[PDB]
């Protein structure tokens, strides 16, 4: 069974920090992004034909570009 909603809810929970920037949220948000990216990559086999999953992968790597992370 695909556990993609688990990854998103956890990410939405962790990304409850506004704004500041110190700076800042760059080291905070990219940690949350990587955690999300890792969670989605772990449930990858189970989400083979899940639309919400395939949207999450393209959504994560889009946020990874601006601002630059990894």
């Amino acid at each position: 069974q695909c556990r993609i909603q688990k990854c998103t809810t956890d990410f939405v929970s962790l990304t409850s920090h506004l704004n500041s920037a110190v700076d800042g949220f760059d080291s905070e948000f990219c940690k949350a992004l990587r955690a999300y990216a890792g969670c989605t990559q772990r449930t990858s086999k189970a989400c083979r034909g899940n639309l919400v999953y395939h949207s999450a992968v393209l959504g994560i790597s889009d946020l990874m570009s601006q601002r630059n992370c990894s």
Partner: protein
Amino acid sequence: KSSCKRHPLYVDFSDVGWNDWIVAPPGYHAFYCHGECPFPLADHLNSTNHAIVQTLVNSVNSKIPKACCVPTELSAISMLYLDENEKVVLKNYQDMVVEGCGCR
């Protein structure tokens, strides 16, 4: 300006980066909703009482925004994807295409 209407939108899965998991179709006509929601509301037969209350509140106080033009009638589509065995699988994906737009 232009009121709440449905607008064309062809989603090419290759441009979007989904050609790797969707076997067929190559894309689909999803459409999108866009437009002003003044009195009387678009899709007024199905529109919520809240949208009716909010567009009335907006008419008295512009600080409160008008209702918003979103898909109110959607339809599903069948797509093909490959599983671990590299075998094609059919699945119906709900609320993929817009049939009608309304104010919410």
